[PDB]
Symmetry: D2
Subunit: 301 residues, 4 copies
Amino acid sequence: PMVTAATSLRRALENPDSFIVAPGVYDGLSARVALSAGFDALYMTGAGTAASVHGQADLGICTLNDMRANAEMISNISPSTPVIADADTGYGGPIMVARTTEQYSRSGVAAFHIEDQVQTKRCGHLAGKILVDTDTYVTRIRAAVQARQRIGSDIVVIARTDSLQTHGYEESVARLRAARDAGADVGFLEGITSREMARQVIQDLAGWPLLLNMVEHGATPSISAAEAKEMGFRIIIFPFAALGPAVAAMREAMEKLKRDGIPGLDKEMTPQMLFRVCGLDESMKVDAQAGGAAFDGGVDL
Amino acid sequence: PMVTAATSLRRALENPDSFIVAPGVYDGLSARVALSAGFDALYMTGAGTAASVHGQADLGICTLNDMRANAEMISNISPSTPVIADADTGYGGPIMVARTTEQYSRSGVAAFHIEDQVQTKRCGHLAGKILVDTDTYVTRIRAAVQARQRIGSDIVVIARTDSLQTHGYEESVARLRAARDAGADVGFLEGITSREMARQVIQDLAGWPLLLNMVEHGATPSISAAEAKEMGFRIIIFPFAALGPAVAAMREAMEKLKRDGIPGLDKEMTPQMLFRVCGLDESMKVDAQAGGAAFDGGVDL
Amino acid sequence: PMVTAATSLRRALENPDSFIVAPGVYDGLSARVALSAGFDALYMTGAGTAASVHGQADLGICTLNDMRANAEMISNISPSTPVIADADTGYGGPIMVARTTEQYSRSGVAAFHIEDQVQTKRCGHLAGKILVDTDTYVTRIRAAVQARQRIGSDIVVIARTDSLQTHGYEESVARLRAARDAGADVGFLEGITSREMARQVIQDLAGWPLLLNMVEHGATPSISAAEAKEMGFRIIIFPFAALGPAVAAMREAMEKLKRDGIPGLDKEMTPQMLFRVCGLDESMKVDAQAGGAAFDGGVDL
Amino acid sequence: PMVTAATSLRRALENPDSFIVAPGVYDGLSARVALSAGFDALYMTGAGTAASVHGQADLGICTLNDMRANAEMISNISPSTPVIADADTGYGGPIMVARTTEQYSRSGVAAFHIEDQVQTKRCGHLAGKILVDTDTYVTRIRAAVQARQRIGSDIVVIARTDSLQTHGYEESVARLRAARDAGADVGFLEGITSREMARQVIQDLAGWPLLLNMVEHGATPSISAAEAKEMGFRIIIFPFAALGPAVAAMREAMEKLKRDGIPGLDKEMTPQMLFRVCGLDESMKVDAQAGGAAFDGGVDLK
Ligand SMILES: O=C(O)C(O)(O)C(F)(F)C(=O)O
Ligand SMILES: O=C(O)C(O)(O)C(F)(F)C(=O)O
Ligand SMILES: O=C(O)C(O)(O)C(F)(F)C(=O)O
Ligand SMILES: O=C(O)C(O)(O)C(F)(F)C(=O)O
Ligand SMILES: [Mn+2]
Ligand SMILES: [Mn+2]
Ligand SMILES: [Mn+2]
Ligand SMILES: [Mn+2]
């Protein structure tokens, strides 16, 4: 019997108390660090995938192949951490949304989210978004739900709406209701603009687990994880938890290297140290375990 | 016709006053950030490829597919900037050394490096490394040379040897010699153990450009670029330039997130901020030029 | 001094007397076979690709990754042989049409066609098609011409319209001329319905090279290369010239393997014969010239 | 729960009565065709993958990435039909054999085979084969077996040796044995020189279910389905069963296209027909059921 984190994430979002905290990772390393810090959930950012795999802004540039491989490898770094993964708008219509679902399920991906934008989608905290009508939107969600059923996957279907910005509060809620009716599992109102409004969605969709996108310095005012739990939310996501820090530091680092002529990393950061963050030691156990002798001796010095 | 940065680097390699300084990057973000900071050349670390793409240590886990893809994107962020891309051992015998060359060429890679380890390779600063003999190795260096000139490519072939730690300085120099005769453009003594030895290679192989691999806190004492230039090297790489610092900053930041429950990114790090680092302005022009409406009134909130 | 069939074909189309016959190929095998036949050009069918890569119909399930990979590899079987690569609707808006143009050009592709359906397009001989408005289409062509030009590519842009069935003859022509004005290299009126439309269109955009798509037993009367040349076409393609016969042959061989329980391939299908169809001899030479003893001996017996 | 055709097959293999007939497919077309002919199992040929995905010979060109992708798409067309996928040598040492085992399980691959060649392998019917040593090889086998249990897959680890051409019959059987020992489920003596040795090897490795690779016009004399069943094989594969014919038919099609200046395909082959061979109807039902109307009025021309 093979296992997926969809299952125990699914049980937790059925327990009305357990609260899910998920930092936003974008590649192998951010995922290894966020694990070491002791988080019990990860979020694979679409934006961060764009950044790292393409060097590109969050503009629909990422392909299903792109997202799925990244989502996959992030999922099996630790197969019991549920991974919540971006899936943008489904990489097409029903035919495509199902492949994405099927794919993300086989991959061990614990949840994903489908938004209501046109396929050449935009970061949610960006102006001038373009949406698809409610009918097409429900059709994506209904495909993802029917797709998981057919293969018996527990993968958690998260319905994002980007419509607040363009269409007003009332309409985004009509969309979330309509996604709840097609069988979605969690509701995702993107870019909540106020505490009044976080409070107001939660009651308007009372008893449906909702998710908060705590992207900072965008449309959404700062809510700590505790306050969100307390407000009623069931999941909070921090898409730039890794990406932000990593940018500031590399920048300073490259400017330092520029004036200086050598990086000057702390003497702690040895290649073995750096490798250990990426599972060196577990990787050599695997070799010694199967009769191999390549890491005979260790690996220092 | 189409241009590649092979020809600049190969040209610059001929003027013996030009000295190529290339920091390590390992994904799009590090790349854009290295570029933003004014570097004239980039080095894509294999180790860093393994870590960001796979979350794995540097042990030959990366496939040609992984490597090339990552090489092409990094190379095309800024087409006029030369990129020296790790090619491990050529991912096979000659047949593969050859596809490796052609594909890196087509990708717009400016230079690459092939070493004398078994395919199932390992970072050069760990104990244990297992090598192939001199003939096989030369076969690889010859395969790259032949495949480049067969397609009319100016990509720069860097001959590396990982054989100092087990076979001794003398052998290491003998393999560089063979390689030089086989037509490599640049010598790569991995894991130079002293300044004595740095000055010494340069002399024993005088006339022939050499790379210094400036990985700190490993086998090589800390030599700055200015100093390497003065010794007589032609290229200096720093594989962990972005990676060390990103690992530190993210570890920090994830620890903060865990205690704090909100990441607290500096206010300067809006979503737009971060996309703008990843070419958002330019992506927005392509559209407008083409001329699209998507982006109309930009994206600011 | 890297080179590309794109430029060879650019030139062909500059002289109106040149006539181009390009059979459909969909994978490495079809490609080798068609090359062995002596054909001077290839057409990588999108439909085709979907069937081999995915085991799926032509419904817009291939992503850019799929199509670029296939196109590149086909293109580099015989680098001197121009390959006309299907490129669907460009895999998104302008941003993606450039990435498509850039990648295809780096891959050695000679030409590609962009059409005017929605991104979840279907084969042009199915009913139903859904189209985007003319402006949105022109925006695509325009991005490919621009993208071409920013990078100095000679790649041929082929403007397709699927508008005949839904909008009729004259809207079709209107769209085509609109694309010509945007810098497109070749017109492509999908599923022309009569031999006199054939001739009407050729004088309707006279001076401008036109492609005939000779897919049989859908929408288009059966017209030959001789006949097409005479009519005044510049390029004739046959998406299923390899595909169909392969299907039918495999169908019959699977029944016969069904009943008889041993395939009974002809005495000449040895493994080695099959391999020589795919460059065994040439890639054994690659090795030797390097050279290892890998195939030292030969491979036979 | 998601269900793997690897279980249905593990269990089929405990039945001493179940004989598995598996034709070699290599792309989606050749999968879809094999299925409709009614086969209950498919074989992904390593060789055929090289040819179709790369245009290249069977020489170690394919990377794990390559092979997994084909193996995955091929398993999931009919997800209840077991797919036995080539795995070459496992693309490196344990670490890599582990990843291969893992990815092939997630993909739905029913079985995969691992050989004792150098990682730059060649078709086991070419000369020149250069092997690795027994220890090294058991390390590979033991790793796919440990990887498999670490994650709880039913995936069937087939053990293959190429050592017959190079090191003789008795060494060939020593290797195959060392490997039953490290936990492999199915044995694969590749390139059987004669029919009395096909009879012999079953005897020598009684207890353990074996696979015949029936590649025609190489080293192995031609032995049929019922005939290998009788002798006592559990699995027979025909790696070129899709690819031989396709080559012959395409060569002819090209000659005809020069002769006639048009393929002259049969009235039967409408685009629709070929598409339906590729599951177009299934595809269109997925859209309708999800509420999409993209295929309203259907898709046959009017
Ligand atoms: O992380 C993401 O990709 C995202 O979709 O959640 C987002 F943050 F960019 C967003 O659009 O909000
Ligand atoms: O960065 C690399 O991949 C490298 O090869 O330069 C190295 F640093 F890992 C090394 O092997 O020294
Ligand atoms: O081969 C193709 O992909 C094609 O676009 O030309 C076609 F045949 F499918 C078609 O749409 O005519
Ligand atoms: O199909 C294959 O790749 C194969 O391994 O079975 C073979 F036929 F090439 C072989 O090695 O015999
Ligand atoms: Mn996103
Ligand atoms: Mn390296
Ligand atoms: Mn097409
Ligand atoms: Mn094989």
